[PDB]
Amino acid sequence: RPMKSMSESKCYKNRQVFPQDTNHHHTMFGGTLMANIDEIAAITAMKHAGAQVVTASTDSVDFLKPIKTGDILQYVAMVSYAGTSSMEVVVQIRIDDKHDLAALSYLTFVALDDEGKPKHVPGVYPEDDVEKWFYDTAPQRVERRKARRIESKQTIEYLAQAQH
Amino acid sequence: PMKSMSESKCYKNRQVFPQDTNHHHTMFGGTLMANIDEIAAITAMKHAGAQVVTASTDSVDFLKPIKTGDILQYVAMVSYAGTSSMEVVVQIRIDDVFNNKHDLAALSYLTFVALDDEGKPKHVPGVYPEDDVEKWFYDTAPQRVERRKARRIESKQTIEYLAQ
Amino acid sequence: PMKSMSESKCYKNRQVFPQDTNHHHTMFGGTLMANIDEIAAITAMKHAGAQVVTASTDSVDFLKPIKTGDILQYVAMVSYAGTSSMEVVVQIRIDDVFNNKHDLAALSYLTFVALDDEGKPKHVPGVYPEDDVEKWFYDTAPQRVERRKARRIESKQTIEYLAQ
Amino acid sequence: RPMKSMSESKCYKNRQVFPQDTNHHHTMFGGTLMANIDEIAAITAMKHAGAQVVTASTDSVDFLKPIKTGDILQYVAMVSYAGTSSMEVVVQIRIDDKHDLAALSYLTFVALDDEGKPKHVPGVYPEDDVEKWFYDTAPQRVERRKARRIESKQTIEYLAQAQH
């Protein structure tokens, strides 16, 4: 199948952190971060897929270090895994000084056709070491995400029964 | 000291406005995550009786598309209490006001950490369920928690690698 | 056909963000009114089992200042059911998560009208209280309703005069 | 006491109604209207008072005619009554063609000093007929607002008892 580099659809974001972006302890609101993460990931996935996409799941968001008033942020997003119709997008959130990693997130997107049906996406390959790390560690993440979906179906059925 | 899941359980009924949705009239994943985080944090704060921070979004499963004009019900509760951490589960339902029936649109799990005035992790009360759904989430929590703990290991591996 | 006040009762737990407050860190009256209207409409829709429109905001009493960082609980319910109209009462409380205690920050009464698919006023179910607070608002509704009806007269006088 | 004309602090607003401002039946959201109303009223009150102000209450908002996608709106706000430290602001919302009155609102504001204590405001006088209508009909509205406050205190006490 047609292949793309991870760099090819890679997206960047630069953002300032203002007092209105943080709580009274000067820590940036998680919701704002989450909104930015999803936004940049969706564009990256659309670029890789060459089609419209939908967020299937947020696999994880880890908040490693507090982001503070006055900090400058750089977001880096890229496709780290390509299934048949699905993509894993990895998003790094760094505090710009040289850069410190403030947060790490993985999301899964599904490409859709004009009919709204899942559509095939190109494969992806890394070119430099970091890209290779994310590419190499993805299959394990994917398998875990799949196991979690399996368990989730049990909960959904229980919750559907709870309503009747 | 222990609290019931009901003591800190939180609800939110919300309309989905155009500012919340994309060009396909589907609610932003980022916005949903921000709303989820917002209500979950309040639940965690109520349970801990102290300030909290979002440690992670463990997962968000986007089950059914949420559309402009939909009515949503968010339900959040503490399903697990560690030493300093809490798992909050958030159910996001699409309310059918005409038929008094609701569809589960999304399911999310998050981890919060309670802090003292000095800003260091602080002990939280234990938690216990009382009704069936509470018991379902409470009973299935240990397996999720083990996964979260497993993820932390990998995040640390990636951080360690990225420091290059 | 009659419904209990509990059947359509709605809740909202919300954090107050900087985007919601002025330079004195006080929440906008307009924003509070928008949130009030939003939750009240959902309650009215649930009760009517049909689409609704806001006929009027009968009053909003701003009792205690709401500040950036506050946690709010909104509670909305139908306190009166006319032929096509409903009175919805909304309580806005400031939650003290530390002490599990809340202060009443604002009180509001609104009138909604149910509509059919053709867009004309439509009959709504009757309403009855079950617990003490519900009974309080239900019992005091007739006096408020007479005031609202009295106001309509004056609004019509003013409209009639303004047509000049 | 020092006196100001109603025209002296009068404020205007012109706004377009876009599809994103209206629901699926092309009717403008009440919350947006309410937000604009409070915003313009607060500025009018500040201008009249020559000081910071707070919204004491929203005395009423009547939605007389549906506002639709593509409509052009004009807001007119002015002080129609001046107590000792308080002001009534009347806000007219018109659909611009010659103009049709879509909504009518009355709010009460309280002027505060730098210490945050209620402060005396100038008196107000009308100059043209419409201003005179609003000025002339105010005392009755004020008295009704006062009677309503009296009743509200009973509810607040009941709700405060309900919590213990």
Place this chain on the structure above:
Amino acid sequence: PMKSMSESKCYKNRQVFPQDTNHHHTMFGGTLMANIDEIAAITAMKHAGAQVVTASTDSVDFLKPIKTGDILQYVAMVSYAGTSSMEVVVQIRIDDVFNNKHDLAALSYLTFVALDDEGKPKHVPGVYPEDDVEKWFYDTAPQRVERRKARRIESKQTIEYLAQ
């Protein structure tokens, strides 16, 4: 066919809040520009008697910092009428309610084009001044118009050239 400059004059009043400012309490240029575009568009729309689009924004100089708590009045009117295009002049004033002071902080010029339902440029009424200030803007418009028209060519050229 001719209209006065005052006939289509539009207003917007808004105060500057902390969420609108940087770390030192200075208003964002983008917020100001968004507001300018909004009010100018309404004026142009009213004068044209049809939908409009922004063809261009002339430069804007920020001479003095606009600060948290400042109250701004935006005033817009048509200063020139071409065939299908209009120059809109927007005055941005700081209202100092405390001292009854009204200072002009910034001046902005924009060009709007009237369009028909087919989306094609449409003839507009002409415009005429009535007082000295209106006449000043009216008199100085032609030079600005000829310069921006030349500038459009320069812009097209630069874009075409860079696409290489």
Place this chain on the structure above:
Amino acid sequence: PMKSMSESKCYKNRQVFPQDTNHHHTMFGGTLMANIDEIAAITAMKHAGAQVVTASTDSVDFLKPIKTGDILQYVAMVSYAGTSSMEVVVQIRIDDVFNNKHDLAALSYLTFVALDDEGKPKHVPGVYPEDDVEKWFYDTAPQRVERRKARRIESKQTIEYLAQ
């Protein structure tokens, strides 16, 4: 002291949604301008190594309508370095993910000034280009700078004159 133009280059990616457009699916100029100002400021801040303020925005020509669903890439870099001031050039491109097409829709120039903690203008590093496109902007900057500097005088004059 010198920095490359690429060294402080900043990015922002955002798609155009219905809430961002007028009745005919065309993007608001104000939204574009807000985005431009945001990304330019971050670039200037990074290059300066200090806080910055927008001194001015050169004119912007809207040559082609930006439409609902378009994906925009904002790219900002410093094209000129004065003593305390910088010219920031912002390219706005429409990414067409479907066809792997990247077209330059608009170009914008802004002037930023670096300030010290006292709020006084501060010396900035110089800037140098490395590739042809950077060099083009670098080469054409002085003319733009001298013209805007003259224009500031004109702006001050006009404001001083109108205050009469």
